[PDB]
Scaffold this active site. Structure first.
Site, PDB file in Angstrom:
ATOM      1  N   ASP A 227      30.770  13.315  30.996  1.00 23.48           N
ATOM      2  CA  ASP A 227      29.420  12.778  31.137  1.00 23.48           C
ATOM      3  C   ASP A 227      28.490  13.704  30.368  1.00 23.48           C
ATOM      4  OD1 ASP A 227      30.017  10.668  33.067  1.00 23.48           O
ATOM      5  OD2 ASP A 227      30.167  12.254  34.586  1.00 23.48           O
TER       6      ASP A 227
ATOM      7  N   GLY B 195      23.460   3.475  26.322  1.00 18.05           N
ATOM      8  CA  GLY B 195      22.333   3.441  25.406  1.00 18.05           C
ATOM      9  C   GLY B 195      22.556   2.708  24.096  1.00 18.05           C
TER      10      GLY B 195
ATOM     11  N   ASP C 129      33.339  -2.561  35.042  1.00 17.29           N
ATOM     12  CA  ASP C 129      33.343  -1.973  36.366  1.00 17.29           C
ATOM     13  C   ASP C 129      33.637  -3.037  37.413  1.00 17.29           C
ATOM     14  OD1 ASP C 129      32.617   0.561  35.268  1.00 17.29           O
ATOM     15  OD2 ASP C 129      30.509  -0.058  35.246  1.00 17.29           O
TER      16      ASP C 129
ATOM     17  N   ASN D  81      37.557   0.399  34.063  1.00 14.88           N
ATOM     18  CA  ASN D  81      37.267   1.360  35.125  1.00 14.88           C
ATOM     19  C   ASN D  81      37.570   0.660  36.445  1.00 14.88           C
ATOM     20  OD1 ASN D  81      35.955   3.219  33.178  1.00 14.88           O
ATOM     21  ND2 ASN D  81      34.264   1.719  33.213  1.00 14.88           N
TER      22      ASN D  81
END
Ligand code: NI
Length: 537
Positions: A248, A317, A389, A454
């Site tokens: 991260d 982003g 996700d 994920n």
């Protein structure tokens, strides 16, 4: 200027050129970028490199528009060394089915075609090897691995390789699935590789150095034991078990870039550590009144790219943004900036769900406006990965939901035997009435080249991946699927590679905490008969 041998690098100003330039400088050479034919003359150029990334037409149209055809042919006729990389290699052919109207230098009279996706994931993304032969060149070693990232290739058959041989071409072959293709070519002063040597770690650095010093080193006298161990068994279609290291990139109180919640060197030094420890890839999850140009994530990529000679992925982003001055900046332009800064792939999260929902609304069609569509059309599917996700949702039968369900081995609370996985957006804070099956299939149709799967509910559990989820998504799409979330020990990687059709495994916390290194996972997989990249500087 003359204190070290100069290497001219043709620069069409598109994609990651950081890795190649840093690789050349790392080898003790000075780089001279040639953006226009006025930037170089034949007589004063001793080493020329023709890098290329992305869509064939996107590269070749740009290259020829800038007026490089004649100066490239003239340089080649001078008999001096030239090296093409990726699309730089493809540019030597008649053209490519990727861009039917584009032309090529036509040194090799046949066009590049798409890999057969009925038997394996397309694009090929990973580490393949050159088939052993008596005519390899520039140190190409069949017992080492090189990084390939493409959907199109010069696919061979008996007739084509014979014509090439009679033509005086030396070919380095590779095989993906049941298809044989050109990994590299060599004829007189022309050398070119389908793989990215600048992205192939030390093994890649060696190939570049061998070209620059114009030498064809004998391959090491490997023992029969080493050969049997290092050879490609064509397991996993001929690709190694890809281990991805993830970190991260957050902003702390003092506005500095960190990896962990409380303490820009940190993300850069951890990426270098990952590479130094065997990471086949390094993924940055960008979770940071700043102008685009000055986005510190771009500096993390540029700095990381100085020593990390492996693929870099950035997620977060990469969308249509509005700059500080109100300048309207498309996802395509934002992606191009990250690419030029050192990223090789961009990860799309939230917009992927929006794109998939719009896709089904429009009747299983795209309007060409999605970041998936725009970024993949310019840089190819291989440059776009979708971060998913999912969350398991139980139902009594397929009759209880519009979404595609599958029969699970683990029945639900009320005894439900079926389930679907609901997709979330905005860092997993908001759910959508879209299953992972529907989401991945739509994103694949829109041009995505890879799925970063994920498993939320497994995140931070260090108990392994959600195996049924991996198999569900593998049933859904044909593009490569990365198993993410849940990995804590090397056994979790083994389980994913042997019990599922996972095309790669990503690790985050386990590598960050120092419990295990990528090499620890690799040594374990190696010991269990799996083929993995083992390369060091
Ligand atoms: Ni000099």
């Amino acid at each position: 200027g003359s204190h070290m041998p100069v290497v001219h690098v043709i620069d069409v100003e598109s994609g990651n050129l950081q890795s190649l330039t840093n690789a050349i400088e790392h080898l003790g050479y000075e780089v001279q970028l040639v953006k226009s034919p006025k930037d170089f003359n034949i007589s004063g150029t001793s080493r020329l490199i023709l890098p290329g990334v992305g869509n064939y037409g996107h590269f070749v149209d740009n290259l020829f528009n800038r007026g490089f055809e004649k100066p490239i042919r003239e340089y080649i006729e001078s008999g001096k060394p030239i090296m093409g990389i990726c699309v730089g290699l493809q540019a030597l052919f008649a053209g490519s089915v990727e861009s039917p109207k584009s032309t090529g230098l036509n040194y090799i009279d046949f066009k590049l075609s798409r890999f057969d996706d009925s038997e394996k994931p397309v694009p090929e993304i990973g580490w393949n090897s050159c088939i052993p032969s008596e005519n390899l060149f520039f140190g190409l070693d069949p017992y080492k691995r090189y990084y390939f990232v493409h959907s199109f290739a010069a696919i061979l058959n008996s007739e084509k390789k014979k014509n090439l041989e009679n033509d005086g071409w030396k070919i380095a072959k590779a095989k993906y699935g049941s298809e044989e293709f050109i990994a590299a070519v060599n004829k007189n002063n022309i050398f070119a590789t389908q793989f990215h040597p600048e992205k192939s770690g030390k093994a890649g650095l060696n190939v570049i150095e061998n070209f620059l010093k114009q030498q064809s080193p004998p391959i090491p006298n490997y023992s029969a034991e080493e050969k049997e161990l290092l050879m490609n068994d064509y397991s996993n279609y001929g690709l190694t078990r890809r281990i991805i290291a993830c970190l991260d990139v957050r902003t702390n109180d003092q506005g500095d870039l960190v990896v962990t919640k409380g303490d820009l060197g940190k993300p850069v030094q951890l990426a270098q550590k990952y590479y130094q420890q065997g990471a086949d890839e390094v993924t940055f999850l960008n979770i940071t009144d700043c102008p685009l140009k000055d986005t510190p994530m771009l500096e993390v990529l540029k700095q990381a790219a100085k020593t990390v000679f492996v693929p870099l992925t950035v997620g977060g982003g990469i969308k249509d943004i509005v700059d500080v001055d109100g300048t309207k900046i498309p996802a395509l332009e934002v992606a191009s900036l990250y690419f030029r800064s050192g990223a090789d792939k961009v990860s799309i999260g939230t917009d992927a769900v929006y794109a998939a929902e719009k896709y089904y609304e429009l009747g299983n069609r795209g309007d060409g406006t999605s970041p998936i569509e725009t970024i993949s059309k310019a840089y190819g599917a291989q440059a776009v990965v979708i971060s998913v996700d999912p969350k398991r949702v139980y139902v009594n039968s397929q009759a209880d939901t519009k979404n595609k369900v599958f029969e699970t081995e683990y029945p639900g609370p009320n005894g439900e035997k079926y389930c679907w996985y609901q997709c979330t957006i905005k860092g997993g804070r908001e759910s959508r009435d879209l299953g992972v099956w529907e989401l991945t299939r739509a994103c694949e149709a829109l041009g995505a080249g890879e799925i970063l799967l994920n498993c939320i509910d497994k995140d931070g559990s260090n108990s392994g991946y959600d195996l049924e989820l991996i198999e569900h998504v593998k049933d859904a799409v044909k593009i490569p699927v990365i198993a993410s979330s849940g990995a804590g020990v090397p056994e979790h990687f083994e389980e994913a590679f042997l019990k599922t059709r996972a095309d790669a495994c990503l690790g985050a916390g386990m590598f960050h905490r120092g419990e295990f290194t990528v090499n620890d996972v690799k040594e374990y997989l190696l010991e269990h008969g799996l083929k993995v990249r083992m390369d060091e500087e």
